Amino acid sequence: AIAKRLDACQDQLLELYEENSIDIHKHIMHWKCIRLESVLLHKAKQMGLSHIGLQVVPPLTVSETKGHNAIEMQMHLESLAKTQYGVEPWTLQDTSYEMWLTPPKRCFKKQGNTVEVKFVMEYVVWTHIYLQDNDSWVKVTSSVDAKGIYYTCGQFKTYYVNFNKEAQKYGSTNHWEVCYGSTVICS
């Protein structure tokens, strides 16, 4: 049963991955399957197993976490999908959990251009950032300046990269240089 369900499940995941869909509804499914695989693998190591076929069963916590994150990504995507933004192209990467944890944290986004800061380090400037207020969504854009990278929602700016702060993790000075496509802004 379980060995079969997990099998059916991991199969659907594989097809999704190899499919490289641009429709957000498919990625909601990926996350839905990731949850099932984590539920099942949880049940699997619960029943005594430690190996299924040639696959190593992971720790009970490992699955708890992954299952937990999946439901988060699952719910946020479903909300977004109800909007005009949901009809846009959404890659498996645009919807990854790692991506979701890239500044600005907990916001979907795409078209991230690379900015370089010499104290060097690279940071991403998102062309499109979608903010979630309850179940409502807004689409804003980013900009770069001497203090850092930020997006704008009204008259207020929100920095998600603080060149200053970022300057402590490196040089002893308060001097840094920002290079953005042949353009250079300096302290």
Swiss-Prot record:
Residue span of region Transactivation domain: 1-187
Main location group: host cell
One cellular component (GO) term of this entry: host cell nucleus
Keyword Plastid annotated: no
Subcellular location, record wording: Host nucleus
Post-translational modification: Phosphorylated.
Keyword Disulfide bond: no
An example Gene Ontology molecular-function term: DNA binding
Annotated keywords: Activator, DNA replication, DNA-binding, Early protein, Host nucleus, Phosphoprotein, Repressor, Transcription, Transcription regulation
GO-annotated biological processes: DNA replication; DNA-templated transcription; regulation of DNA replication; viral DNA genome replication
Subunit architecture: Binds DNA as homodimer. Interacts with protein E1; this interaction greatly increases E1 DNA-binding activity. Interacts with protein L1; this interaction enhances E2-dependent replication and transcription activation. Interacts with protein L2; this interaction inhibits E2 transcriptional activity but not DNA replication function E2. Interacts with protein E7; this interaction inhibits E7 oncogenic activity. Interacts with host TAF1; this interaction modulates E2-dependent transcriptional regulation. Interacts with host BRD4; this interaction mediates E2 transcriptional activation function.
Family of this protein: Belongs to the papillomaviridae E2 protein family.
Summary of the function given for this chain in its UniProt record: Plays a role in the initiation of viral DNA replication. A dimer of E2 interacts with a dimer of E1 in order to improve specificity of E1 DNA binding activity. Once the complex recognizes and binds DNA at specific sites, the E2 dimer is removed from DNA. E2 also regulates viral transcription through binding to the E2RE response element (5'-ACCNNNNNNGGT-3') present in multiple copies in the regulatory regions of the viral genome. Activates or represses transcription depending on E2RE's position with regards to proximal promoter elements including the TATA-box.
Protein name: Regulatory protein E2
UniProt source species: Human papillomavirus 11
